[PDB]
Design an enzyme around this catalytic site. Structure first.
Site, short mmCIF file in Angstrom:
data_model
loop_
_atom_site.label_atom_id
_atom_site.label_comp_id
_atom_site.label_asym_id
_atom_site.label_seq_id
_atom_site.Cartn_x
_atom_site.Cartn_y
_atom_site.Cartn_z
CG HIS A 133 -2.91 -2.34 12.30
ND1 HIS A 133 -1.69 -1.76 12.14
CD2 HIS A 133 -3.38 -2.55 11.04
CE1 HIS A 133 -1.42 -1.63 10.86
NE2 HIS A 133 -2.44 -2.10 10.16
CG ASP A 181 0.41 -1.86 14.74
OD1 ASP A 181 -0.31 -2.85 15.02
OD2 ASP A 181 0.36 -1.24 13.65
N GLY A 238 -2.01 -2.31 3.00
CA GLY A 238 -1.54 -3.65 2.59
C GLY A 238 -0.08 -3.92 2.94
C1 LIG Z 1 -6.16 9.05 4.42
O1 LIG Z 1 -6.07 7.81 3.71
C2 LIG Z 1 -5.26 6.79 4.15
N1 LIG Z 1 -4.69 6.79 5.38
C3 LIG Z 1 -3.91 5.78 5.78
C4 LIG Z 1 -3.70 4.72 4.91
C5 LIG Z 1 -2.80 3.64 5.39
N2 LIG Z 1 -1.50 4.03 5.41
C6 LIG Z 1 -0.54 3.21 5.81
C7 LIG Z 1 0.86 3.69 5.80
O2 LIG Z 1 1.75 2.94 6.22
N3 LIG Z 1 0.99 4.97 5.42
C8 LIG Z 1 2.16 5.59 5.20
N4 LIG Z 1 3.26 4.98 5.32
N5 LIG Z 1 2.14 6.88 4.87
C9 LIG Z 1 -0.86 1.94 6.23
N6 LIG Z 1 0.17 1.15 6.64
N7 LIG Z 1 -2.14 1.52 6.23
C10 LIG Z 1 -3.14 2.34 5.83
N8 LIG Z 1 -4.44 1.80 5.90
C11 LIG Z 1 -4.58 0.39 6.33
C12 LIG Z 1 -4.88 0.31 7.84
C13 LIG Z 1 -5.06 1.67 8.56
C14 LIG Z 1 -6.25 2.53 8.11
C15 LIG Z 1 -6.74 2.32 6.67
C16 LIG Z 1 -5.65 2.57 5.63
C17 LIG Z 1 -4.26 4.75 3.64
O3 LIG Z 1 -4.09 3.76 2.70
C18 LIG Z 1 -4.77 3.81 1.44
N9 LIG Z 1 -5.04 5.78 3.29
#
Ligand SMILES: COc1ncc(-c2nc(C(=O)NC(=N)N)c(N)nc2N2CCCCCC2)c(OC)n1
Length: 245
Positions: free
Chosen positions: A46, A97, A196
């Protein structure tokens, strides 16, 4: 990484920092990964699927900071970008993934192990630690869900592996979590992976050695109650990893 501690690359010397060249000149952080052999970094599909052109990416090993050079760091082109054929994205969950980056320098060399650059072992097939097992996550990912910036300094925290059965309760993730995924979380939900951190290592001591158990994949927010981190279960992908390497 939400909570945890600052670290340096010596504590996770397999950690790869993956960046993308922008049409113009500027370079932005994409995702972490893990050196599993001198020529191969393992990460999350992804991370690349929107920009699947290998020439756009740079990998650093031996790198402790986001926007400064670490003494001893090696910089690589991506000679191969292998994305999992059966990758799919839901509203929340990534499936399959997992991605492989074959790295080589401008001078055509792979990674040279050092104090700051080591490979991590893959697990034995379908062999993961029990629930309650403490594992380490590493990344340059957000310190708070709402942050605009990534941290300059690499971070790492501890999370506990959660049973497949606990992670599939509806108020957690229901059926979003499959047998090819792992859940890990803090009992207090106070520390976690975040945006990130994707593609970066989930490491467990297994048969008394540091083992790449997981790859940061997805989660609903970060350090939210009943919303564990979701990890690609590396022990269910060894054939795909062996075959493409
Ligand atoms: C509801 O808000 C939200 N949801 C998902 C993400 C997000 N989370 C993770 C992640 O690994 N989360 C976790 N371990 N709990 C992760 N690995 N990556 C995350 N994004 C990057 C790519 C996926 C969608 C956008 C956020 C986020 O980051 C600010 N914010």
């Amino acid at each position: 990484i939400i909570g945890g501690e600052f670290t340096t690359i010596e504590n996770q010397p397999w950690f790869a920092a993956i960046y993308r060249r922008h049409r113009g000149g500027s370079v932005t952080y994409v995702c972490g990964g893990s050196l599993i052999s001198p020529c191969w970094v393992i990460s999350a599909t992804h991370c690349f699927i929107d920009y699947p052109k290998k020439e756009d990416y740079i990998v650093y090993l031996g790198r402790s900071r986001l926007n400064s050079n670490t003494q001893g760091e090696m910089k690589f082109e991506v000679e191969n970008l292998i994305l999992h054929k059966d990758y799919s994205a839901d509203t929340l969950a990534y499936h399959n993934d997992i991605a492989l980056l074959k790295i080589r320098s401008k001078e055509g060399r792979c990674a040279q192990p050092s104090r700051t650059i080591q490979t991590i072992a893959l697990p034995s097939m379908y062999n993961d630690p029990q629930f309650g097992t403490s594992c380490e996550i590493t990344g340059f990912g957000k310190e708070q869900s709402t942050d605009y910036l990534y941290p300059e300094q690499l971070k790492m925290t501890v999370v506990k592996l959660i049973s497949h059965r606990e992670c599939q309760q509806p108020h957690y993730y229901g059926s979003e979590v499959t047998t090819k995924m792992l859940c890990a979380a803090d009992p207090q939900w106070k520390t976690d992976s975040c945006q990130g951190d994707s593609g970066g290592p989930l490491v467990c001591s297994l048969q008394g050695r540091m083992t790449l158990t997981g790859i940061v994949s997805w989660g609903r927010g970060c350090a939210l109650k009943d919303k564990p981190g979701v990890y690609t279960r590396v022990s269910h992908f060894l054939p795909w990893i062996r075959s493409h390497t």
